[PDB]
Amino acid sequence: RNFNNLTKGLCTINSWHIYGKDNAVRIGESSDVLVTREPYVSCDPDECRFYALSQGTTIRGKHSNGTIHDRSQYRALISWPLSSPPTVYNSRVECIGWSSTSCHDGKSRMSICISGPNNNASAVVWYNRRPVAEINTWARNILRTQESECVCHNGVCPVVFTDGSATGPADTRIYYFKEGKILKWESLTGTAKHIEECSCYGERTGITCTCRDNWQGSNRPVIQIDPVAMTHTSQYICSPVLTDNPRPNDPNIGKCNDPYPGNNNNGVKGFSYLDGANTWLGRTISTASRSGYEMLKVPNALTDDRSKPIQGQTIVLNADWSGYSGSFMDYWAEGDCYRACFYVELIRGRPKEDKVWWTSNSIVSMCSSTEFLGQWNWPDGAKIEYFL
Amino acid sequence: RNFNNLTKGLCTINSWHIYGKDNAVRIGESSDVLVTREPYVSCDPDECRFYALSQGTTIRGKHSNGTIHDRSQYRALISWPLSSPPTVYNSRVECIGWSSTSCHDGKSRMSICISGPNNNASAVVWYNRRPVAEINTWARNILRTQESECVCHNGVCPVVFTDGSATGPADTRIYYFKEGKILKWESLTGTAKHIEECSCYGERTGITCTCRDNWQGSNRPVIQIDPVAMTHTSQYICSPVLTDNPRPNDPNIGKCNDPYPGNNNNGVKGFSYLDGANTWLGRTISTASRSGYEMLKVPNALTDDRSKPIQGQTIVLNADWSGYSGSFMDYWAEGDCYRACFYVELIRGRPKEDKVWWTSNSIVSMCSSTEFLGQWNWPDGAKIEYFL
Amino acid sequence: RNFNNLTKGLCTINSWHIYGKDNAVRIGESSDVLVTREPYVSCDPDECRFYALSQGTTIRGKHSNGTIHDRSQYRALISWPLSSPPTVYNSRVECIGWSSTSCHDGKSRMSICISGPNNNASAVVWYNRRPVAEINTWARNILRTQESECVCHNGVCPVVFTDGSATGPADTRIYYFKEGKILKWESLTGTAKHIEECSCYGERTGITCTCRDNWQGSNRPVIQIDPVAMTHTSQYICSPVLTDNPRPNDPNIGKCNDPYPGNNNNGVKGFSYLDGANTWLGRTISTASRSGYEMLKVPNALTDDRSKPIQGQTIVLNADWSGYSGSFMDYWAEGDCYRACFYVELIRGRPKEDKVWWTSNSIVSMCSSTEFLGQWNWPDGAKIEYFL
Amino acid sequence: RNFNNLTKGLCTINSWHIYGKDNAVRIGESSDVLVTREPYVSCDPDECRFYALSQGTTIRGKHSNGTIHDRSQYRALISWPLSSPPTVYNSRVECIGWSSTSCHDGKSRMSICISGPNNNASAVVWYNRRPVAEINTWARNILRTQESECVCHNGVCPVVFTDGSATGPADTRIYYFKEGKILKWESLTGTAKHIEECSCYGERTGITCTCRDNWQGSNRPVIQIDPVAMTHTSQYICSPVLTDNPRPNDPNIGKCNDPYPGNNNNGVKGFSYLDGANTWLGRTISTASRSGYEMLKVPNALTDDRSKPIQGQTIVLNADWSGYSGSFMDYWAEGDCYRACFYVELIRGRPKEDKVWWTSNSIVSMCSSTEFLGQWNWPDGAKIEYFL
Ligand SMILES: *[C@@H]1O[C@H](CO)[C@@H](O[C@@H]2O[C@H](CO)[C@@H](O[C@@H]3O[C@H](CO[C@H]4O[C@H](CO[C@H]5O[C@H](CO)[C@@H](O)[C@H](O)[C@@H]5O)[C@@H](O)[C@H](O[C@H]5O[C@H](CO)[C@@H](O)[C@H](O)[C@@H]5O)[C@@H]4O)[C@@H](O)[C@H](O[C@H]4O[C@H](CO)[C@@H](O)[C@H](O)[C@@H]4O[C@H]4O[C@H](CO)[C@@H](O)[C@H](O)[C@@H]4O[C@H]4O[C@H](CO)[C@@H](O)[C@H](O)[C@@H]4O)[C@@H]3O)[C@H](O)[C@H]2NC(C)=O)[C@H](O)[C@H]1NC(C)=O
Ligand SMILES: *[C@@H]1O[C@H](CO)[C@@H](O[C@@H]2O[C@H](CO)[C@@H](O[C@@H]3O[C@H](CO[C@H]4O[C@H](CO[C@H]5O[C@H](CO)[C@@H](O)[C@H](O)[C@@H]5O)[C@@H](O)[C@H](O[C@H]5O[C@H](CO)[C@@H](O)[C@H](O)[C@@H]5O)[C@@H]4O)[C@@H](O)[C@H](O[C@H]4O[C@H](CO)[C@@H](O)[C@H](O)[C@@H]4O[C@H]4O[C@H](CO)[C@@H](O)[C@H](O)[C@@H]4O[C@H]4O[C@H](CO)[C@@H](O)[C@H](O)[C@@H]4O)[C@@H]3O)[C@H](O)[C@H]2NC(C)=O)[C@H](O)[C@H]1NC(C)=O
Ligand SMILES: *[C@@H]1O[C@H](CO)[C@@H](O[C@@H]2O[C@H](CO)[C@@H](O[C@@H]3O[C@H](CO[C@H]4O[C@H](CO[C@H]5O[C@H](CO)[C@@H](O)[C@H](O)[C@@H]5O)[C@@H](O)[C@H](O[C@H]5O[C@H](CO)[C@@H](O)[C@H](O)[C@@H]5O)[C@@H]4O)[C@@H](O)[C@H](O[C@H]4O[C@H](CO)[C@@H](O)[C@H](O)[C@@H]4O[C@H]4O[C@H](CO)[C@@H](O)[C@H](O)[C@@H]4O[C@H]4O[C@H](CO)[C@@H](O)[C@H](O)[C@@H]4O)[C@@H]3O)[C@H](O)[C@H]2NC(C)=O)[C@H](O)[C@H]1NC(C)=O
Ligand SMILES: *[C@@H]1O[C@H](CO)[C@@H](O[C@@H]2O[C@H](CO)[C@@H](O[C@@H]3O[C@H](CO[C@H]4O[C@H](CO[C@H]5O[C@H](CO)[C@@H](O)[C@H](O)[C@@H]5O)[C@@H](O)[C@H](O[C@H]5O[C@H](CO)[C@@H](O)[C@H](O)[C@@H]5O)[C@@H]4O)[C@@H](O)[C@H](O[C@H]4O[C@H](CO)[C@@H](O)[C@H](O)[C@@H]4O[C@H]4O[C@H](CO)[C@@H](O)[C@H](O)[C@@H]4O[C@H]4O[C@H](CO)[C@@H](O)[C@H](O)[C@@H]4O)[C@@H]3O)[C@H](O)[C@H]2NC(C)=O)[C@H](O)[C@H]1NC(C)=O
Ligand SMILES: *[C@@H]1O[C@H](CO)[C@@H](O)[C@H](O)[C@H]1NC(C)=O
Ligand SMILES: *[C@@H]1O[C@H](CO)[C@@H](O)[C@H](O)[C@H]1NC(C)=O
Ligand SMILES: *[C@@H]1O[C@H](CO)[C@@H](O)[C@H](O)[C@H]1NC(C)=O
Ligand SMILES: *[C@@H]1O[C@H](CO)[C@@H](O)[C@H](O)[C@H]1NC(C)=O
Ligand SMILES: [Ca+2]
Ligand SMILES: [Ca+2]
Ligand SMILES: [Ca+2]
Ligand SMILES: [Ca+2]
């Protein structure tokens, strides 16, 4: 087969339809379902699969105790069939680590996992299910990457890494891989002041990443990558529709080239589709915590610092817990346009539900429709009392 | 490969032989078997599989409590190997929703799932395991479809939808899909007064659907579809051998173009094979509840309002619980005729068995034989006391 | 590919080596392992698999209670990978019934399952995983077949059926199938007086079956089938080395054309390889019950009514429970000869171990070696006390 | 496809990166994970898999009691996907026995399992998942082999066997197989005085095996095999960096042609990569017991009896239990050199942790990097108290 080429634009987004949902915590109440977090979705040319970081234990297992913690030797990037739960028996390990990304270039899949202590972490780059390249920490402070899928064009797969402080200036790099080999890396340029957990998608040979400013910003940084020239720029989403969490209330003027102030040293992985009048932003409904999720249609959100929503769709009720969210698309689907998709991590357990001693999640996933479809709300659906 | 063409007639039906049985509730007593309902069977060119709507929980799981309810965000159309039970580890999710149909056109499979609140539901049409088209509710009252397999001819797959009241005039539409794309839809025509949960099969390029009148009728509506012209007609089975449930006792004159009165606002999904002198009708044995199941040979049942049985076969004893039933055939089998097949849903739990708090089912399935085979009876076989 | 042709002779048998063992009862103590009995082994051109009749429940499941009973609606022929246990999640259902046979003809597999009440049973013949032909009971008294693999030559697969009394003259038929279709059947001829549960193998275009006389004989009946002419003969193993169970002690003169007397109305499925000086007989060690298993080299056992052993190999200690045993070979292996193989069913539970309320088994399997290998003994290995 | 040819040299080893980890004991606390020991890793041309000897029971199963014992009829060589745990439902049995080796020659896999009583054991050689050759015990004292992967060149796969005393002179043989057939065997020659559990790898058509002297030596014997000439030599690692366990403290002069004294009648399976200045040795950190694991870069360790480490990497902390370790490589990976890999068995349970009555293990695996990567430590990670 051939390397995928990013030759299409986004389909017109008029609403979102249900794509996938695994009900993992519900099923895991009485099945051998692995404890996970930081999930995402990624497509092969012939299959789409759920991905996540396992904690090396099942939910009902006693080793689920303490799984609020993010980094350990027992974590691994796993994948499993669309909308099935991540079970011990159906999960495929991609690589070992506690921070990851993965994407198919059209011929084979590249997966990257970072492991190690906070001051000595390293990334291993897998291609065609074999280790090919390794990257040592350059700032010795939790080398970390996207936690959702990367995107490839003509064999070149850009990946965003950060190494350094989570609460101040850090060392962000953009690596360009081909068949797992490092073609090039570059230090972050542009006006984005802090970069974490980028969510990316590709269309008419450009790759757009929406990231998390964990330092001073509650507006989201954007990295725009040219995979042919292997260069990039960065800024913030200009819109006063703020989409980090926690965050201040929406003002009437946003910030294009600096963090919007109000909330320090926190954030959540999120995403957006920036496409002129076809622009949709995702965010938690609550400004205080990771609960609820909504999509908002905000024309020219990227460049217009006065832009407001003209349409929306609730995905998860404010009464229900959400979590990380990110973008993916089926680049191998039929048609003349790419259908925008996304997932929302539905975190259950600690810290918000501390009657149990574990932290896990389930997945809900949506794709865009050209129809104006009716909306439902999609909770995790598990009852904590059952786990007591 | 090629689109299947409906070029054969039905094989002569002289009896029925066992085809499949999954014993799901028996096995689920101590295995991770998903709670389901509304099952069916559908064939690929190289495999036949069981299908059903999962409830997003196992039987022994505590989330099985309350699964009598038909619609929730935790349901999904799943498929699994013939005669195996629907387990967490062997079930493949086709799409997310609480009403479905699915069929293979010879090249790829189309699956349709409806999800949403009762007043804002939508259908998503999957083809080759990718979402392709979406249909919003047109009557804002539980958009719903067949709950058994559709049938394709030369790539065109007709599907019957209903939106609107379950106890009065509703808005029924027949959609015609090809590779998941909508070619055409039409409002229901003919003399059928209410349409639910159609069971369909195809033979010498015609498709026949036997449905459920949930309004005033205890005779079954029939929709006859021309997949080439993409048109249809409708009436009722003329025979006084009534096959809905609940139902009045069999009279000596049936009704061809209007509901046979006696039982309002109820019914059950059922099926028939209408083939002149080779006509067989399925029905519950009880006239009051979903218990027992029998096949009855009723010559020209479709057109003769005096027709009575001349042969029969008991499938499930009246002492045992049945449920939904529907038609399917292996359109890719060897031979010069299509072998008529059907399944019977064996519902266990609520409402009839309320010592448990769940509702699930197992599956039994039969195919026709040209031999006059001896009959057995095929119960679910689980003992409720074991679940207490 | 092509139909297999029986062009090779048996390899010289100088000892037996371990081939497969699933430890099903051991593992089933704390895993979802299906209750089975009547197991066997059969090879595809690219894989060899274990086969058995499931009871539609796991061992730890409460529905395991009462599984001593042979016939029910919840039984099915299942297959699963060599030496793995028969689990809910890895078992493939071949067909539904309580008596079976199965074999690959080189192109596709034929499987036959019999189901029904004792007075109205029927066989369904599956080919390429589709139902093709059906056979109704002809004597209305538990239609039953081999319970081990059949053998094919040039597409023709002979199968031995019995219908009628288990304790007197019955109606035995030999059917000849091709691609699941009935070419021919014939009533049993020759001097065998009663036929049950034939174990068969093929070599230089002839098929040899060793069966069970359940009426008056403790010597085993033999059916020799010509799959080209589609004819057969029958007699008994002439050797005074008696191999049924229960049985009298070995005399010095056997019987070629009549039952050897001593034990009425009982027996066990067994096998032999009849090959002149390369002849090996299998039997339980105990003359009273299904315990122990040994192979004995008995030159010209088939034709010499004075023949005694000159070599042997213990497979299962007399202290351990055995059960049914049968023949199979990998007809698609490399080399100029067929390697003789066999399995022994290791029955655990009732009636011999009635502290538990279930009956199940595990499998041990051996193949011949041209070496004179050391012998071990191969028990089931489960401790009943663990199940209490 | 073609036979693999050993045409490449080793990649430069500057550090080790995480390759695989299954967390089997952690997951097995509440999942159907098989009890194992003596694990290893071996690659097919299209997949790499974990291997081990099952004990025919799960960890939580009551039959786990007593699994400290090495040899029984319930053991089997199993394989399962990389970094998944060995479960009842995902494990593939290669052959039956309690001592094994396995390797892919480029076309098909050869697996060898030894079974039997201590005085009558036999090896069965499987090729392309079929039994092909058998070897009877020649010294009648626990015939045993490598317990890690063999290596093939141009279809010829050498395997090291030992039969005889574990505490004195034994009968070691090197067998040369092709497609499972015995080409040749030879008695051990050279200056190695005792040989057990060889760990092998291949590079520029030579095969190097690092073994265990269980008699008088705490330095490791090395067998160097020419797979073309089908001949071999043997000696000890000359370096005073002793790598058996238990062992004396490191002296300043090692021994090339005789055991280094201090510890009798014990040892552990281990490995090394002997490659001039690119030489790395593995060993337990403790000199007294199987705890901890480290890699040490020891230039010309094989030939220089004064050689000391100049670099190292800790794999497992001394505080954590280790066990057997061995070599493997992906001979089918891209690039101009073979990437050195190894696994470490992480033994949990008895004898060191006798609060539980079982003995099992998990696996950690590393591969070499040309980068100087930061190091982590990789414990099994299970808490014994959870199993009480
Ligand atoms: C069946 O399903 C269908 C399909 O899903 C359902 O229909 C959907 O219904 C939902 C809910 O109502 C809609 O979502 C909302 O959309 C509005 C935007 O639409 C309105 O505004 C448009 C823009 O108007 C402005 O510009 C135009 C210029 O052209 C001008 O004409 C106009 O006067 C005004 O100047 C209008 O165009 C639009 O009209 C159109 O659509 C109507 C249908 O909705 C139709 O009737 C009309 O004829 C016309 O066609 C419409 O008036 C979003 O504003 C809204 O999002 C806000 O509100 C939700 C709460 O509901 C909140 O969570 C959001 O975050 C957001 O509110 C926050 O952000 C604002 C921006 O900063 C801020 O100003 C707010 O104060 C608020 O801020 C606070 O909360 C946030 C969040 O916690 C916090 O961060 C802040 O700090 C602060 O605390 C919804 O997304 C769908 O659009 C609609 N879809 C369709 C296809 O119709 C249908 O209801 C279902 N049926 C049933 C029976 O259930
Ligand atoms: C081994 O297995 C074999 C194979 O399975 C077993 O053989 C099978 O046995 C079963 C059970 O007996 C049979 O099923 C029944 O079939 C009859 C129909 O067959 C009879 O009627 C035929 C038609 O006769 C009429 O027309 C001809 C014109 O040509 C005329 O000659 C005749 O005088 C009459 O006018 C006859 O042709 C037929 O004879 C043939 O077959 C005989 C074998 O059966 C053979 O001996 C003959 O020589 C000849 O070859 C035979 O007489 C069905 O009527 C019947 O279905 C009714 O009864 C069951 C209860 O058993 C019920 O559940 C059904 O719903 C139905 O009854 C309801 O509906 C009627 C129509 O509305 C109504 O009139 C009834 O009052 C009743 O209504 C009530 O109940 C329903 C249900 O709850 C409710 O909804 C209503 O409101 C109301 O309350 C059976 O299906 C198989 O046909 C037969 N198969 C074969 C191949 O033989 C064999 O028994 C097994 N062996 C052993 C040892 O077990
Ligand atoms: C490592 O592993 C190896 C390989 O497995 C082990 O070696 C094996 O050891 C076993 C056990 O000893 C052997 O099995 C037995 O074989 C004998 C047959 O071999 C003997 O007889 C041969 C025939 O001799 C006759 O004919 C020749 C004519 O040529 C004539 O010369 C001779 O005088 C006599 O007339 C001999 O050729 C043979 O010698 C050869 O082999 C020797 C090694 O064994 C070797 O030393 C010699 O040099 C020569 O090479 C040998 O003498 C079987 O008879 C026997 O089977 C009977 O006994 C067992 C009990 O052990 C029983 O279960 C069987 O059912 C059977 O006994 C019943 O049936 C008889 C026939 O009806 C009847 O007469 C008996 O009374 C008895 O009947 C009772 O019990 C049954 C069962 O319950 C019941 O139904 C009846 O009603 C009644 O109650 C064994 O199968 C293997 O052959 C041997 N293999 C090899 C390759 O060596 C080795 O031991 C292991 N090492 C260690 C350390 O453990
Ligand atoms: C982030 O990760 C990185 C990457 O992993 C971490 O960096 C790693 O750090 C570890 C730990 O320090 C290092 O492992 C040790 O390596 C040393 C060898 O390196 C030293 O020695 C080299 C050789 O020097 C000699 O020769 C040269 C001739 O050229 C001569 O110049 C010199 O004077 C001397 O004569 C030096 O070249 C080397 O310097 C280089 O590297 C430095 C970085 O380390 C750098 O700063 C320099 O500039 C230069 O580039 C360095 O000095 C091993 O010796 C050591 O292994 C011993 O010690 C461990 C305990 O730590 C023990 O377990 C080992 O078994 C071994 O000690 C036993 O064996 C000896 C030999 O028999 C014996 O003499 C000992 O007494 C001891 O014996 C006892 O214990 C054993 C075991 O129980 C028992 O069997 C005996 O009987 C007895 O009881 C370590 O392996 C890595 O090399 C290093 N990697 C890299 C790439 O830097 C970094 O730390 C991490 N960062 C953070 C913040 O955590
Ligand atoms: C989890 O571990 C903590 C110790 O850190 C303990 O206090 C708590 O009881 C544990 N919870 C359970 C459910 O075992
Ligand atoms: C099921 O839920 C109901 C609450 O709606 C509760 O009363 C009942 O006890 C529950 N049953 C079980 C078995 O937990
Ligand atoms: C099995 O069923 C019988 C009733 O036939 C009952 O007496 C016995 O206690 C049951 N055994 C178990 C273990 O439930
Ligand atoms: C394991 O078996 C021994 C008998 O050898 C027994 O004493 C011990 O209690 C058993 N342990 C468990 C946990 O059953
Ligand atoms: Ca922030
Ligand atoms: Ca009705
Ligand atoms: Ca008998
Ligand atoms: Ca030693």
Residue of B nearest to A333 (CA): B130
CA–CA separation, A302 and A209 (whole Å):
12
The structure tokens listed for D317 are: 């902390």
Dihedral sign from CA coordinates of A123, A127, A129, A132: negative
CA–CA separation, D13 and D22 (whole Å):
24
- C-alpha distances out from residue B340 to B16, B40, B46, B196, B331, Å: 9, 14, 18, 22, 10
Which helix (H) or strand (E) is A364 found in, with range? strand A359-369
CA nearest to C291, candidates C329, C247, C251: C247
A/B interface, count of CB pairs below 8 Å: 112
Which of A17, A29, A374 lies closest to B62 in CB terms? A29
In terms of residues, how long is chain D? 388
Question: Ligand 6: which of B58, B63, B65 to mutate, judged by most atoms within 8 Å of the beta carbon?
Answer: B65
Known binding residues of A for Ca(2+): 213, 217, 244, 266
Q: Which residues of A60-93 are buried (b: 16+ CB within 10 A; e: fewer)?
A: bbbbbeebeeebebbbbbbbbbbbbbbbbbbbbb
- Chain C residues whose CB is inside 8 A of the D124 CB are 17-18
Question: Is A330:A46 a contact under the CB 8 Å cutoff?
Answer: no
* Ligand 6 pocket check for B12: Cβ under 6 Å: no
CA–CA separation, B67 and B53 (whole Å):
11
Between β-strands B9-10 and B337-338, what pairing exists: parallel, antiparallel or unpaired?
parallel
CB atoms within 10 A of CB B278: 18
The structure tokens listed for C206 are: 């002839």
A/D interface, count of CB pairs below 8 Å: 112
Testing the interface with A: which of D21, D22, D364, D386 to mutate, by most A Cβ within 10 A? D21
Between β-strands B9-10 and A34-43, what pairing exists: parallel, antiparallel or unpaired?
unpaired
Place of tokens 């079982």: D358
Which residues on neighbouring strands pair with residue C232, listed in sequence order?
C225
> Which atom of ligand 2 has the smallest separation from the CA of B294?
63
Which of A26, A33, A373 lies closest to B56 in CB terms? A26
CA–CA separation, D241 and C2 (whole Å):
61
Testing the interface with D: which of A73, A132, A179, A358 to mutate, by most D Cβ within 10 A? A73
> Within the 21-40 window of chain A, which residues sit less than 8 Å (CB to CB) from chain D?
32, 34
CA–CA separation, B33 and B54 (whole Å):
10
CA–CA separation, A237 and A210 (whole Å):
9
Dihedral sign from CA coordinates of D27, D33, D38, D42: negative
Map C183-199 to HEC letters. EEEEECCCCCCCCEEEE
Question: Ligand 1: which of A13, A245, A247, A250 to mutate, judged by most atoms within 8 Å of the beta carbon?
Answer: A250
Burial of B75 (0-12, 13-18, 19+ CB in 10 A): buried
Which residue ranges have their beta carbon within 6 Å of ligand 3?
A: C 241, 249-250, 285, 287, 294, 296, 308-313, 372, 374-375; D 119-120
> Which atom of ligand 4 has the smallest separation from the CA of A117?
105
CA–CA separation, D163 and D147 (whole Å):
14
Q: Round to the nearest angstrom and report the end-to-end CA distance of chain A.
A: 51
Determine the distance in angstroms separating the CA of C385 from the nearest CA of chain B, rounded to an integer: 20
* Ligand 7 pocket check for C185: Cβ under 6 Å: no
- C-alpha distances out from residue C324 to C37, C352, C357, C362, Å: 9, 15, 20, 11
* Ligand 2 pocket check for B250: Cβ under 6 Å: yes
CA–CA separation, D163 and A118 (whole Å):
49
CA–CA separation, C192 and C211 (whole Å):
10
CA–CA separation, D387 and D116 (whole Å):
32
Residues 6+ apart with CB under 8 A from D13: D273, D275, D278, D280, D297, D340, D368, D369, D370
* Ligand 1 pocket check for B118: Cβ under 6 Å: no
Q: How far is ligand 11, taken at its centre, from the CA of residue C238, in Å?
A: 15
Which residues on neighbouring strands pair with residue B104, listed in sequence order?
B109
Catalytic residue among D44, D70, D258, D304: D70
Dihedral sign from CA coordinates of D308, D314, D316, D317: positive
Alpha helices in A256-381 (DSSP H): none
Known binding residues of C for substrate: 37, 71, 196-197, 212, 290
The structure tokens listed for A318 are: 């404010």
CA nearest to B22, candidates B39, B46, B38, B43: B39
CA–CA separation, B209 and B150 (whole Å):
9
Residue of C nearest to B333 (CA): C130
Burial of C316 (0-12, 13-18, 19+ CB in 10 A): buried
> Which atom of ligand 6 has the smallest separation from the CA of B356?
13
Contact A57 D26 (CB under 8 A): yes
Alpha helices in chain D (DSSP H): 24-28
Residue of D nearest to C385 (CA): D62
Dihedral sign from CA coordinates of B196, B202, B205, B208: negative
Place of tokens 């850090």: A170
Domain range list for chain B: 1-388
CB atoms within 10 A of CB C231: 14
**Torsion, CA B306, CA B311, CA B314, CA B319, rounded to 10:** 50
- Chain B residues whose CB is inside 8 A of the A84 CB are 88, 91-93
CA–CA separation, D93 and D74 (whole Å):
12
Catalytic residue among A40, A51, A201, A324: A324
The structure tokens listed for D65 are: 């009691």
Map A128-168 to HEC letters. CCEEEEEEECCCCCCCECCCCCCCCECCEEEEEEEEECCCC
Dihedrals phi, psi of D63, to nearest 5 degrees:
-75, 0
> Which atom of ligand 8 has the smallest separation from the CA of D65?
1
Dihedrals phi, psi of B62, to nearest 5 degrees:
-70, -20
Would an 8 Å CB–CB cutoff place B166 in contact with chain A?
no
Which of B26, B369, B374 lies closest to C137 in CB terms? B374
Question: Ligand 7: which of C65, C68, C388 to mutate, judged by most atoms within 8 Å of the beta carbon?
Answer: C65
**DSSP state, D27?**
H
CA nearest to C366, candidates C337, C318, C335, C330: C330
CA–CA separation, B301 and B278 (whole Å):
10
CA nearest to D197, candidates D245, D238, D128, D250: D245
The structure tokens listed for B333 are: 């089998």
Q: What is the CA radius of gyration of chain D?
A: 19
CA nearest to D289, candidates D255, D254, D320: D320
CA nearest to D77, candidates D97, D57, D61, D103: D97
CA–CA separation, D93 and C141 (whole Å):
41
Determine the distance in angstroms separating the CA of C210 from the nearest CA of chain D, rounded to an integer: 25
Catalytic residue among D51, D273, D324, D331: D324
Strands (DSSP E) found in D22-155: 34-43, 48-58, 76-81, 92-96, 99-104, 109-115, 122-127, 130-136
Which of D30, D90, D379 lies closest to A60 in CB terms? D30
Does residue B244 have a known ligand-binding role?
yes
Please indicate whether residue A70 is annotated as part of the active site.
yes
- Chain D residues whose CB is inside 8 A of the C17 CB are 122, 124, 131, 134
The protein residue whose alpha carbon is closest to atom 93 in ligand 2 is B311
Give resolution in angstroms. 1.9
The protein residue whose alpha carbon is closest to atom 35 in ligand 1 is A310
CA–CA separation, D357 and D64 (whole Å):
7
Determine the distance in angstroms separating the CA of C94 from the nearest CA of chain B, rounded to an integer: 9
Side by side, the strands of the sheet bearing B181-187 are: B156-164, B170-178, B181-187
CA nearest to B373, candidates C124, C141, C175, C99: C124
DSSP string, B146-202: -SS----BTTEEEEEEEEE-SSS-EEEEEEEEETTEEEEEEE--SS----EEEEEEE
CA atoms within a 13 Å half-sphere pointing along the CA-CB vector of D55: 25
Contact C93 B81 (CB under 8 A): yes
- Chain B residues whose CB is inside 8 A of the A367 CB are 131
Instruction: State the method.
Output: X-ray
Q: What is the set of active-site residues of C? A: 70, 324
CA–CA separation, D80 and D49 (whole Å):
6
Question: Is B238:B302 a contact under the CB 8 Å cutoff?
Answer: yes
Question: Is C6:C207 a contact under the CB 8 Å cutoff?
Answer: yes
For A1-388, CATH gives 2.120.10.10
Contact D375 A93 (CB under 8 A): no
Determine the distance in angstroms separating the CA of D278 from the nearest CA of chain A, rounded to an integer: 19
